[PDB]
Hints:
The structure is cut from a larger assembly and holds chains A, B, C and D. Helix content of chain B is about 20%, strand content about 35%. By secondary structure, chain B is of the alpha+beta class. Chain B has one domain: Alba-like domain (Translation Initiation Factor IF3), CATH 3.30.110.20. The termini of chain B are far apart. Chain C has one domain: Metal-dependent hydrolases (TIM Barrel, Alpha-Beta Barrel). In chain C, about 30% of the residues lie in helices and about 10% in strands. In chain C, the strands form two sheets. Chain C has a four-stranded parallel beta sheet, with helices on one face. A two-stranded parallel ribbon of chain C has the order 5-6. At the A-C interface, helix 1, helix 5 and strand 4 of A face helix 1 and helix 5 of C. The structure holds two RNA strands. It is classed as hydrolase.
Amino acid sequence: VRLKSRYILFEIIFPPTDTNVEESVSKADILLSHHRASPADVSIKSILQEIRRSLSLNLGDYGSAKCNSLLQLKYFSNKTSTGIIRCHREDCDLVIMALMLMSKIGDVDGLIVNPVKVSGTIKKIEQFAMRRNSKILNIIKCSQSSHLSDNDFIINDFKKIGRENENEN
Amino acid sequence: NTHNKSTKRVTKHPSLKTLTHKQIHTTIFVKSTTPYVSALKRINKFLDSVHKQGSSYVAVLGMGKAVEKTLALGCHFQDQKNKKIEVYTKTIEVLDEVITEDVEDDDKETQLKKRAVSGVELRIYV
Amino acid sequence: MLVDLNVPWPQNSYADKVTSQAVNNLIKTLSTLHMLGYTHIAINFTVNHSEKFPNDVKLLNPIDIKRRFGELMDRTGLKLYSRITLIIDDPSKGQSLSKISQAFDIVAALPISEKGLTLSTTNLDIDLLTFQYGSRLPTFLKHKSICSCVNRGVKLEIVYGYALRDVQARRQFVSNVRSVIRSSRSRGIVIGSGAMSPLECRNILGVTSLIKNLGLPSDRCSKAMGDLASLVLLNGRLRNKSH
Amino acid sequence: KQLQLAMHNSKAASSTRIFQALPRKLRRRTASHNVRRIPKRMRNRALREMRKSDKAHGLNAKQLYKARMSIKLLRLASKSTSMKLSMPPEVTSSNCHVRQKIKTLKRMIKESSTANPNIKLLNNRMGSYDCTGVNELAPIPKGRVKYTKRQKHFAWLPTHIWNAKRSHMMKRWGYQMVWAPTQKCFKLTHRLGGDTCSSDGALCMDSSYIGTIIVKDKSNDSEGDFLKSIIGKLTAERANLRKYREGQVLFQGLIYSFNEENGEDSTKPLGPCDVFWVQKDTAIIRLHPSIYTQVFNILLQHKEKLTVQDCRYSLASVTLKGAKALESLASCLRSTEYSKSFEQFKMVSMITDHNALPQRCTFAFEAIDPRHLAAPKKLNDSQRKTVNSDDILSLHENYPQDEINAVFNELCDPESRTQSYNNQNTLKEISARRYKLLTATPNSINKTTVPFKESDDPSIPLVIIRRLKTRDWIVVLPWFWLLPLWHLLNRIPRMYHIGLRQFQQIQYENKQLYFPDDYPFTQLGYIENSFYKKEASKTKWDRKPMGKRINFEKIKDIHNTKLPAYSGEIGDFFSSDWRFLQILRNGIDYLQRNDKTLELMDSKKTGQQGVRDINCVNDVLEFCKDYEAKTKAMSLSIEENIPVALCKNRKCQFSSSFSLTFFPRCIIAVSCTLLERGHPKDNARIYQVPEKDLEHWLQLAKGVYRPNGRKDHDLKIPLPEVHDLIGFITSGTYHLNCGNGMGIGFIDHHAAIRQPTRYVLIRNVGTNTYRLGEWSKISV
RNA sequence: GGUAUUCUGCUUCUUGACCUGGUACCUCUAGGGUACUGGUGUUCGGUACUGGAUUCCGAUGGAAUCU
RNA sequence: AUCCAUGACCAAAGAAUCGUCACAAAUCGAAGCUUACAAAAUGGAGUAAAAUUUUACUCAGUAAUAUGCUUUGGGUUGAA
């Protein structure tokens, strides 16, 4: 036979969690504030190291060895924190448990790691990511005139993440 | 003159059309009994595979029951989706069969008549 | 839809009023929960069932839901509700719940000792039951106590909030959740979230796995935040016909 | 071999273009690389024939065959390369030139039996003639000797050697017809041959198996008026009326078998029929093969007054379906002269939605050999694109009657279509004629199609008719001309051929019946139902180990209360059993002779003049059980328990004649659509909706929602009795034109005319789940 | 008169190996093709079509451009 | 001439039904609900009021009901 696989698409949300801010309330501003980029101190190695730390403490040897057999980080972007990870089909829930029970990546603090979808093939998570980015761009360009979000935290990024690092067939 | 006391059977015919294999793949005929989400999905999936036919718009198109329904869909694409649409009002002519007017069955003599209605074409850009 | 119904309201008793920073924190955490996917939310409130309830029929629910949060029920579609978490310790001290029934939608109970726990399942007016998963539940609880209430219209609740604060509370949480699952034979379990901060919230498609790898069948993990949590809210709202 | 020329060629393109892989319907796999292998039986005979060394001097009794086959063996084993016999046998090492040229070919065969009479060779260099029997049946057309040996029982269609390479065949009714192609075509059939508007192609079916009978009067008076009586008796009084005779529009209905010759007489439906009138004293009849002979001999009872030609071996036909159908056919047809009926054909081949055209759209003209074109070609139609609804009204007044009749009458005469072959060209001489076009006189044209001669080339009569009920195009042609045309018609880039299953699916989608499978009131539909499908199903059922198949008599909670007669399911497990329906419904009706309140069972009254009392309904069920496997599984009896709906009114009825199998119970044909989940397969059962729980089912129809917001499905499904069975479903699958499951079937007539609503309950065979549905009538 | 078995007749038909030597003939341009008649002296043939759009010509035909 | 037990060989076939799984899009995947109309376009049918005009209404019932409904996914007539 052939070995199955599962791909997990994880984002990183950086909530403000600071007092004396009194933000505005609108679907555009909440997303535009929670979705700031990553401070570039995180890397492809920091996330993997932290997700290995969170398994050998919230699970034991027989929980940190049934997942570490096949666990590879494929694609990660800093302009938008989306990333893709790969694991065995029967041992994907333990990786999710590692995801939630883990915060404070490396030294960066006050953040949430958010797995948004899991799927078998790799051809389909690409389409899902494209649809997700299209949906975000549509919702940010409809609240008002789009260029009131002129800071361009993410607007120039979705178009330019087309296939630059996504040629992993 | 003559009052149209034609309560006898009338077999309404579809309007005469003609296609060119380019209007086949870039046109939608909204029926009266079309569920809303059905046509929504159909339109949403033609605006993704129309460039390869060398076109730049999709022609939603309907009359009678369809018109307000049609217009509703147009609204959903004007705002909340940020696309530009054009509206055209058209007149249409269709043909109706009427009998010439023992006991015989449905198979009676036929005569054609012409009747006109009005509809709307609505072009949604990409 | 998704229902999360254990967001705490920053007030300890009927004496103090709400400050500014507390409500400022509450609004931010509500916005974050709205982003993560939740649509319907309820707001908690803790008392002791042995205190002087306001005599007048007003100002007994200081939530003030229609003036505050008026700019969040529009500009984004999430809806908000109200609930109170009575703490029962003694089999006496009156104050029968016929009074506060009209002023809320969801009434819960948080028994502490054996007498309180056996009173709670005996005869009250609650429509939900909760425990203190933080530490030191009164152990050896069996199907005998819980069967009678769960046969009637009562539900059990898990919070999963204490799994996020500290390791020492995490161990007690994971110890007690297994007991409460296996005592009720996986019947009438719903999930809330104790979010004291805009950091202690989580998504859906992982917490279901967090409950599935503890003992709950995968067929029930998909109805905690769902049909049962919707039915409790539907009944609570339909109770408002007292007027 | 220099890439500079490759760069120069690509200069007529982009820098670095990308090409797609082939579509999956145009791919082939590589065969073997070594030459083919001969059978051993053809090797031994040739080897022993060459190794052999060499009283009117003929003396050739039965040895003529030996010589005439040894010649073929010598030629084959002297010509073919795949023949690897041994080392010695060669063309010259053994006497092959001397043999069979100066020893056998002329000294032996020629000098024994003189050539028999009828040395009329032909008017062709390809065997092509007519096979018609005036007032008698006709045999198989002569052809290749090898392939005419296998047609002793089942004949061949003109295209059989072509279809056999690309389809799954079967053998029925004396023909070897085509069932289905070798690819999945469920959705493509719908969206290219259905009533959709997304059609960019067409479907062509070789329907030569449908016979053709050309009946005509012989009183020499054009008024006829006796063929009118025959046609009006043969069917109901339909196909002899002003609409069908004078307007000569096509007819489709039901054909009977009258037998009025001595006192008591009756009629029994047989099946569909196509009757076309011409000049008021000629008729053409098209029939399914199964009912071909039975009606035919009937006409032979009056051949003193009419004349009949079994021309089913001389006329061929093709059926076309789809939107771009006439556009593709018109790309392979040209004329000889100028005729208005080709102008109309040119104009109407640009509609793309054939439902707008009127009732009658007959075309008829004379085409040329379609092998001239060498490639299908459009009709330069793009110039004119302003067709409106005003020129269509001209088609009902500008009808070329005489020009249709004159070209039509060259099909109802054997010698005329014999002259039609007067000089049929071989492929090589057409090739040479085309080659002679590289040195033409205009010298500024570069034409490809060969010219046409005024008198030294044949003219092919051709008719095209439109069938409204089936919504398709018939094209009728002489037999031996079919193969040259059919070769071009399949070179269109988007033309697909279909078998017989696709025809059934197409006629299912349009809410219409199907003669073989879905006529349980005809003498052959009943056989196909209760004798042919049942064996094919049971043979594969009882031939499985027990426990690896659905147990039929062990099913729980089928009905609200259980009768001990049937342990599990009701009726036969493999077919729509109509005998049980008749017996059960008649017994239920008799149980309410004067006691309105029925009663199911009385607890152990007794066991049984051969008394069979009619007290309880369990008694009716055990009567039905007794009547089967002990009265018709060991003996034979024939009856038609299923009539069809009649315009008259004979609803009601009532110790002398009270048998439960003596009167036919009228039914009707309906189509049922499901409002909720369901997927009705074949032979499923149809129950009426009980008066109790009507409110619950109505509420389910309106909609019951969970607190979540979705639909509520998991409730308590109530159940009806066993005397609520009123119908069966004969064809059902997922209906793509509406997106929900749908079925077609029959229901008892008296059941529907007493329903207070319009809902029914559907459940498959071997299951206890009841789905809801709503039914609508079919006017057949 | 029948069926299973056994021996003897009859009917089913498109002038067809390859190479090559002769005579007669042909509407073919000194050479080609066809009839009658002699000589033992492992894959190779012909004919044929791309999908779509726009344009031009006193036409059931012909011509040009782009993709 | 009969039966039972063990062993060898040959041959057939490789279970059916019901329920749940968050997003103006979803799911571990796929598909369906596009021959534009109620004969209200021979320039629709009627009711009330005021000096043809002006101002108020009735008539469309399988009516229509909004990211909604329905079907299906390893050997389909065993070996993919």
